[PDB]
Write a protein that holds these residues in place. Structure first.
Motif, PDB file in Angstrom:
ATOM      1  N   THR A 132      33.306  39.113   2.121  1.00 20.37           N
ATOM      2  CA  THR A 132      34.210  39.751   1.176  1.00 20.37           C
ATOM      3  C   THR A 132      33.848  39.285  -0.231  1.00 20.37           C
ATOM      4  N   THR A 133      32.685  38.654  -0.317  1.00 16.00           N
ATOM      5  CA  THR A 133      32.160  38.141  -1.571  1.00 16.00           C
ATOM      6  C   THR A 133      30.715  38.603  -1.760  1.00 16.00           C
ATOM      7  N   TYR A 134      30.091  38.188  -2.857  1.00 11.20           N
ATOM      8  CA  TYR A 134      28.706  38.553  -3.127  1.00 11.20           C
ATOM      9  C   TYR A 134      27.767  37.679  -2.306  1.00 11.20           C
ATOM     10  N   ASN A 135      27.578  36.442  -2.750  1.00 15.06           N
ATOM     11  CA  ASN A 135      26.720  35.503  -2.044  1.00 15.06           C
ATOM     12  C   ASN A 135      27.570  34.739  -1.028  1.00 15.06           C
ATOM     13  N   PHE A 136      27.410  35.076   0.243  1.00 14.28           N
ATOM     14  CA  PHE A 136      28.191  34.454   1.314  1.00 14.28           C
ATOM     15  C   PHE A 136      28.019  32.934   1.388  1.00 14.28           C
ATOM     16  N   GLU A 137      26.820  32.447   1.116  1.00 18.80           N
ATOM     17  CA  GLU A 137      26.544  31.016   1.206  1.00 18.80           C
ATOM     18  C   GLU A 137      27.386  30.175   0.240  1.00 18.80           C
ATOM     19  N   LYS A 138      27.450  30.572  -1.029  1.00 18.34           N
ATOM     20  CA  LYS A 138      28.201  29.802  -2.020  1.00 18.34           C
ATOM     21  C   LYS A 138      29.718  29.869  -1.803  1.00 18.34           C
ATOM     22  N   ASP A 139      30.246  31.062  -1.539  1.00 16.29           N
ATOM     23  CA  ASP A 139      31.686  31.225  -1.346  1.00 16.29           C
ATOM     24  C   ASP A 139      32.104  30.840   0.069  1.00 16.29           C
ATOM     25  N   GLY A 140      31.516  31.490   1.059  1.00 15.30           N
ATOM     26  CA  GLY A 140      31.825  31.171   2.438  1.00 15.30           C
ATOM     27  C   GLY A 140      32.913  32.036   3.045  1.00 15.30           C
ATOM     28  N   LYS A 141      33.379  33.044   2.311  1.00 14.73           N
ATOM     29  CA  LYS A 141      34.422  33.929   2.821  1.00 14.73           C
ATOM     30  C   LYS A 141      33.832  34.976   3.758  1.00 14.73           C
ATOM     31  N   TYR A 142      34.299  34.991   5.004  1.00 13.05           N
ATOM     32  CA  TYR A 142      33.789  35.917   6.001  1.00 13.05           C
ATOM     33  C   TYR A 142      34.843  36.226   7.048  1.00 13.05           C
ATOM     34  N   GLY A 143      34.473  37.098   7.960  1.00 18.42           N
ATOM     35  CA  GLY A 143      35.339  37.465   9.038  1.00 18.42           C
ATOM     36  C   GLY A 143      34.636  38.377  10.006  1.00 18.42           C
ATOM     37  N   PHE A 144      35.172  38.502  11.204  1.00 15.51           N
ATOM     38  CA  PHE A 144      34.552  39.347  12.203  1.00 15.51           C
ATOM     39  C   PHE A 144      35.156  40.739  12.179  1.00 15.51           C
ATOM     40  N   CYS A 145      34.289  41.739  12.213  1.00 19.75           N
ATOM     41  CA  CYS A 145      34.717  43.129  12.173  1.00 19.75           C
ATOM     42  C   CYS A 145      35.261  43.574  13.527  1.00 19.75           C
ATOM     43  N   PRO A 146      36.561  43.906  13.593  1.00 16.21           N
ATOM     44  CA  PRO A 146      37.199  44.343  14.834  1.00 16.21           C
ATOM     45  C   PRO A 146      36.914  45.809  15.150  1.00 16.21           C
ATOM     46  N   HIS A 147      35.643  46.123  15.382  1.00 18.39           N
ATOM     47  CA  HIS A 147      35.247  47.488  15.693  1.00 18.39           C
ATOM     48  C   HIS A 147      35.473  47.755  17.175  1.00 18.39           C
ATOM     49  N   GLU A 148      34.503  47.388  17.998  1.00 14.40           N
ATOM     50  CA  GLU A 148      34.621  47.568  19.434  1.00 14.40           C
ATOM     51  C   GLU A 148      35.047  46.259  20.089  1.00 14.40           C
ATOM     52  N   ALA A 149      35.639  46.344  21.275  1.00 12.28           N
ATOM     53  CA  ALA A 149      36.084  45.153  21.986  1.00 12.28           C
ATOM     54  C   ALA A 149      35.008  44.668  22.947  1.00 12.28           C
TER      55      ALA A 149
END
Length: 59
Positions: free
Chosen positions: A42-59
């Motif tokens: 949910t950010t630009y550079n994932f490494e520096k910020d660290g904000k992430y999440g798993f996409c609840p598409h298929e189970a």
């Protein structure tokens, strides 16, 4: 939207494209995840910020 659930985001959305080690993804990838779980940032550079999440598409 609501493409993020699990992780340290909770409520955040998939920011496309996000930067992962120099590679921009226009979708959820399982890269870095040996669990085969698709995620996004949910950010630009994932490494520096660290904000992430798993996409609840298929189970």
């Amino acid at each position: 939207r609501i493409p993020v659930k699990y992780g340290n985001a909770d409520g955040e959305y998939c920011k496309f494209p996000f930067l992962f080690n120099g590679k921009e993804y226009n979708s959820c990838t399982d890269t870095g995840r040996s669990d085969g779980f698709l995620w996004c940032s949910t950010t630009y550079n994932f490494e520096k910020d660290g904000k992430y999440g798993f996409c609840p598409h298929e189970a």
